[PDB]
Design a protein around this ligand. Structure first.
Ligand SMILES: Nc1ncnc2c1ccn2[C@@H]1O[C@H](COP(=O)(O)OP(=O)(O)O)[C@@H](O)[C@H]1O
Ligand SMILES: [Mg+2]
Length: 382
């Protein structure tokens, strides 16, 4: 008895969970009221493990004892060149254990813990499970979980293993861009179609060319950038305010990690607000040296600060087209996935790339992966 099967987007930076209930997909909000959850772990001084928003939001002078971006390590060996490059940018200790890159952190009271990447991902899955369980008012045992299309055998297996640690039977692993297409019902169409999935998220950018024929998807080609996303757009805005504050006050605020953390949280909030309004205020009491911070950001200025990075997203799209032996006019469907596709300028540049073709619309782009997983989970629940 598989009970109510859940659909989980286990994301690099943000995860999402949904279920099929009363004839439709329901995307479930977590205990902080958010329909997405950061793939983030941290610890209190008392040694309590925090997961999700609470972990990401905890102010700290010790980023080395937070864990995030475990998806960059999952299913890879310690000596994988990708791992050896990624660890340069991660503030937490990564150590070789049993051929793998385990994560070593201090959790409180001088206690040290070492975790496999799948154990970290299992923590996030546990949080997504608890989210679903609170919504349904009962336990969940089975899930459909998504992975990037480029995930290999070990990465898929390690994701299943993370499920298992979390007490979830991962019944099916499905590809992210495929799940997005399913969310839009592109699998329920007749004939042979080419689908371009443009997935611009928090830390990663993935472009996928799918073909759909007779209900079966084929991933023809993939491309993107493993270190481009909304975090990068945030940092351009951070740089801008950090420089302006120095120019006003003579002080550089990077000396204080808590100040940088506060500013990053408000900047990300303003960025989001600027996808639906033209100006946002950034305010922080006791920002730095007991002085308050109060500045505004316009949509135009946000765009100007990131325009080169926005425009860089088209190059991977042109590459997947060349690799698929396709031209722009061969694309029958454009699917926008990922939170950063809420940015009006991104929408605009994708549409202009495709000479005025409108993309699929109606599902929140940061939810579309979980949505698709949930559609399949509905069928499996019966
Ligand atoms: N309304 C908005 N306007 C602009 N960007 C938005 C939003 C809402 C979320 N975001 C940005 O989306 C990024 C996370 O994307 P995601 O697909 O949820 O995460 P992931 O699957 O980990 O790449 C994050 O960088 C998050 O800040
Ligand atoms: Mg994603």
């Amino acid at each position: 008895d598989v009970g109510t099967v859940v659909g989980i987007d286990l994301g690099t930076t943000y995860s999402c969970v949904g279920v099929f209930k009363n004839g439709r997909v329901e995307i479930i909000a977590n205990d902080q009221g958010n329909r997405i959850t950061p793939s983030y772990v941290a610890f209190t001084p008392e040694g309590e493990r925090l997961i999700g928003d609470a972990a990401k939001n905890q102010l700290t002078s010790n980023p080395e004892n937070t864990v995030f971006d475990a998806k960059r390590l999952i299913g890879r060996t310690w000596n994988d060149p990708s791992v050896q490059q990624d660890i340069k940018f991660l503030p937490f200790k990564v150590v070789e254990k049993k051929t793998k890159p385990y994560i070593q952190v201090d959790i409180g009271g001088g206690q040290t813990k070492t975790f496999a990447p799948e154990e970290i991902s299992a923590m996030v899955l546990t949080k997504m499970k608890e989210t679903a369980e609170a919504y349904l008012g009962k336990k969940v045992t089975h899930a459909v979980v998504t992975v990037p299309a480029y995930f290999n055998d070990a990465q898929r297996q390690a994701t299943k293993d993370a499920g298992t640690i979390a007490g979830l039977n991962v019944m099916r692993i499905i590809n992210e861009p495929t799940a997005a297409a399913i969310a839009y019902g592109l699998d329920k169409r007749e004939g042979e179609k080419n689908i371009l999935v443009f997935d611009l998220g928090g830390g990663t950018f993935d472009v996928s060319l799918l073909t759909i024929d007779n209900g079966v998807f084929e991933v023809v080609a993939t491309n993107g950038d493993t270190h481009l996303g909304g975090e990068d757009f945030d940092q351009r805005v951070m740089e801008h305010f950090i420089k302006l504050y120095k120019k006003k006050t003579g002080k550089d605020v990077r000396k204080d990690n808590r100040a940088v953390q506060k500013l990053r949280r408000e900047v990300e909030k303003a960025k989001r607000a600027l996808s639906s309004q033209h100006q946002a205020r950034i305010e922080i009491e006791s920002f730095y040296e007991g002085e308050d911070f109060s500045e505004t950001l316009t949509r135009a200025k946000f765009e100007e600060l990131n325009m080169d990075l926005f425009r860089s997203t088209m190059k991977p799209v042109q590459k997947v087209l060349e690799d698929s032996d396709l031209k722009k006019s061969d694309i029958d469907e454009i699917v926008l996935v990922g939170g950063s596709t809420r940015i009006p300028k991104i929408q605009q540049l994708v549409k202009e790339f495709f000479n005025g073709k409108e993309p699929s619309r109606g599902i929140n782009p940061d939810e579309a992966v979980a949505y698709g997983a949930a559609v399949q989970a509905g069928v499996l629940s019966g």
